[PDB]
Structure 1
Amino acid sequence: YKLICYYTSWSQYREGDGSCFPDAIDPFLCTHVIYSFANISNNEIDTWEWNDVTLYDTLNTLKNRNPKLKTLLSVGGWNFGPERFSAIASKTQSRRTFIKSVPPFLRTHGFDGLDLAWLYPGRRDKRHLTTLVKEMKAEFIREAQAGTEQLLLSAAVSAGKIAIDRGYDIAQISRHLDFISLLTYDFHGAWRQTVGHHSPLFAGNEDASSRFSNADYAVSYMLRLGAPANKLVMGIPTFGRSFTLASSKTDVGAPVSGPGVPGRFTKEKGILAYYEICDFLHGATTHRFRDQQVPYATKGNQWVAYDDQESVKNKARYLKNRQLAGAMVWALDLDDFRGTFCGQNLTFPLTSAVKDVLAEV
């Protein structure tokens, strides 16, 4: 099984213990580690942060301890305008220029592949995305003639039915990608004025109309559309989504006023790292959706949807049962990487729980 793990560059800036650098990563935890995110300048792949060249080197030295470890550099991301990807892929000339700049950059910095994080292609982009993937892969095939191991090509893809139907030719890109990571943790949050879980595994016979907004539906749908199970990787989150309640009601459908209060370390309204959730739990009431198989907690007027060791193990078993290629984790820097916030002295408790299940078979 593959265990794909993302590391985000901006996590180096969090204060105190929240600060995470590539060397905090256990070389034997994941099979693949993806660095997020690279930029595109003058239609060529480029660094993003001032010290990326140094962090690339730090990350890639983990391979001196685990020679089987593979690293990839992810291009795009949320702070990368989707329109920007749009413009590059739409024109043969700018697309060729970008594709050509990739292999030498990857080789120079010691990466084993490129991850595409175009979030997200729209109806008018579907054809160009296919073109981008095909031609990128052909270039990688060509570059390997030089005697070096062929570069890997992956992509992070929406798990939302409407997003999938609108922007992706799944049957086509599946044949050119080495693996596809499903973003199965964005099924709510988004700004909708009700309380709900962003990463449920199953639909849950209760208050539903989404009926498409759960991991099981997304996986089934991808398989139906033509993606082979052996190229599909299921996304598992290591963060939680928070809400400020509008009333004293805590159960399903409870009214919400806006996102939750920022965490001390991550400092972003609406999100909390798992290590911050471990702290938040002291004094909170914990619950679990029996149908969706995911937990949530409340304290004061704060409501948090998250994943714990039990739900993450549950998701890992599910993907093994569907015979998928593996799991993807977003993100290592949001897991209890120091192993000092969540109690039982274990570094990366969530990611380790997934790895354990995956190693059972």
Structure 2
Amino acid sequence: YKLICYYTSWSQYREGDGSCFPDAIDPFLCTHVIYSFANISNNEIDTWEWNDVTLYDTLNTLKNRNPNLKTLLSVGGWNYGSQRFSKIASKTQSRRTFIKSVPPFLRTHGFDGLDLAWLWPGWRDKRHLTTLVKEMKAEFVREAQAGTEQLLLSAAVTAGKIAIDRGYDIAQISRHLDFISLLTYDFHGAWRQTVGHHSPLFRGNEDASSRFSNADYAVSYMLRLGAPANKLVMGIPTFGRSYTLASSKTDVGAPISGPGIPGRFTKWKGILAYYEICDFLHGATTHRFRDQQVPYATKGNQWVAYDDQESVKNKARYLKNRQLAGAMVWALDLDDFRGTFCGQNLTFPLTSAIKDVLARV
């Protein structure tokens, strides 16, 4: 079973103990470590940060410790216009320039493949997303001829039913892709003027407002659309989402005034790291959606839907039974990487719990 772990390039700026570089990463933790993010310019893969070349090197040296670890580089992400990506993929010469540009860049910096983080294609874009993956793969196949082991090509897919339908032809891209990472942690939109869990496993017996907002639906649907199990990786959040309550009402359907306050380290409204969360838990009221098997916390006018070791193992169990390829972790820098915030002296608590589960019978 593959354990695919993402690392973010900006994690480095976070203040104090939030500062995370790639040298903090335990080399036998994951199987595939992906580095976000990579930019495009002059229609070809380029770096984002001012010192990615150093960081790439720091990552791809961890491979000296674990000769078997594989490392990919992801392209795009959100801080990067769909319109931009779309512009490149929709034309035959810009799509070819960019493609032609990857293998050498990737080989220069030690990466073993490319992850396509197109934070999402429109419906006019679906056709080119297929053409882009198809042609991209063909290039990795033609450079394999030159000695070095073939470059892995993976894609990052959203788990929202409308989104999949809009810009992804699953049956077609699953052939050309080495694995698909399904983003099962964005199941609770902004508009929702209430609390709710973003990465629930099951529906929720309370009042199905759209039988589709959970990992289980999303998984069935991909396997239904034709993505083989041996190619699916379920996405597991290592972070939580906070919201500021609009009343003292704290359970299902509770009203919401807007996102929760910024964390001390992550400094972003509406989101918290697991290390920031273990700290928040102190003097909080914890609960659990029996139905959806995921926890949430609450203190003051702050309510959080998050993922703990039990929930994360429970997901890691589910996907084994489903016989999927493995799990994907949205982010390493957001797990308790120093292992100094969550009680037990264990670094990467959350990602370790899974790893353990992937090796059980």
Report the TM range for the smaller structure's normalisation: over 0.9
Deviations 1:2-37 (A, max 9, x none): 000000000000000000000000000000000000
Alpha-carbon distance in structure 1 between the residues aligned to 2:138 and 2:84: 23
Preserved CA contact (<8 Å) 1:189 1:241:
no
- Superimposed CA distance per residue, residues 267-313 of structure 1 (whole angstroms, 9 cap, x where no aligned partner): 00000000000000001000000000000000100010000000000
Question: 1:8 touches 1:331 (CA, 8 Å); kept in 2?
Answer: yes
Is the contact between residue 239 and residue 335 of structure 2 (CA under 8 Å) also seen in structure 1? Answer: yes
Whether contact under 8 Å (2:74, 2:116) holds in the other structure is yes
Q: Give 1:189 shift.
A: 4.0
Q: In the alignment, which residue of structure 1 is the partner of 2:65? A: 65
Contact persistence 1:191–1:258 (CA under 8 A): no
2:202–2:293 CA contact under 8 A, matched in 1: yes
Q: Which digits, 9 at most, give the CA deviation of each residue in 1:52-92, with x for residues without a partner? A: 00000000000000011000000010101111001000001
Q: Deviations over 1:220-271 (max 9, x none)?
A: 0000100000000000000000000001000010000000000000000000
Structure 2 distance, partners of 1:122, 1:212, is: 20
* Residues in 1 aligned to 2:193 and 2:131: alpha-carbon distance in whole angstroms: 38
Work out the CA distance in 1 between the residues paired with 2:79 and 2:340.
Answer: 30
Preserved CA contact (<8 Å) 2:241 2:306:
yes
In structure 1, what is the Cα distance between the partners aligned to 2:59 and 2:181? 21
| Cα contact 1:182–1:233 (8 A) shared by 2 | yes
Question: In 1, Cα distance between the equivalents of 2:123 and 2:206?
Answer: 32
- The structural deviation recorded for 1:192 is 2.0
Find the residue that maps to 2:60 and give its secondary structure: helix
* 1:208 CA drift (Å): 1.1
Match of 1:344 in 2: 344
1:190 CA displacement: 3.0
Q: How far did 1:344 drift? A: 0.6
Q: Deviations over 1:32-51 (max 9, x none)?
A: 00000000001010000011
TM-score (norm 1): 0.99
Distance 2:235 2:190 in 1: 17
Distance 2:175 2:289 in 1: 37
* Superposition CA RMSD, Å: 0.6
Q: Is the 8 A contact 2:122 2:167 kept in 1?
A: yes
Q: How many residues align?
A: 361
Using the size of structure 2 for normalisation, the TM-score is: 0.99
| Cα pair 1:189 1:196 within 8 Å, conserved | no
Query: Cα offset for 1:193?
Result: 1.1
Q: Would the aligned equivalents of 2:182 and 2:233 in 1 still touch at CA under 8 Å?
A: yes
Mapped partners of 1:340, 1:59: distance in 2: 23
Per-residue CA deviation, residues 186-209 of structure 1 (Å, 9 max, x unaligned), is 000434211100000001221112
Q: Quote the Cα distance in structure 2 between the aligned partners of 1:195 and 1:47.
A: 37
Tell me, in whole angstroms, the C-alpha distance in 2 between the residues paired with 1:278 and 1:190. Answer: 24
Gaps of 5+ in 1: none
**Contact 2:241–2:304 (CA<8 Å) still a contact in 1?**
yes
**Contact 2:206–2:252, Cα closer than 8 Å, also in 1:** no
User: Counterpart in 2 of 1:280?
Assistant: 280
Name the residue aligned to 2:110.
110
Structure 2 unaligned regions, length at least 5? none
Q: 1:210 & 1:160 partners in 2: Cα distance?
A: 11
Look up the match of 1:22.
Answer: 22
Decide whether the 8 Å contact of 2:202 with 2:216 is kept in 1: yes
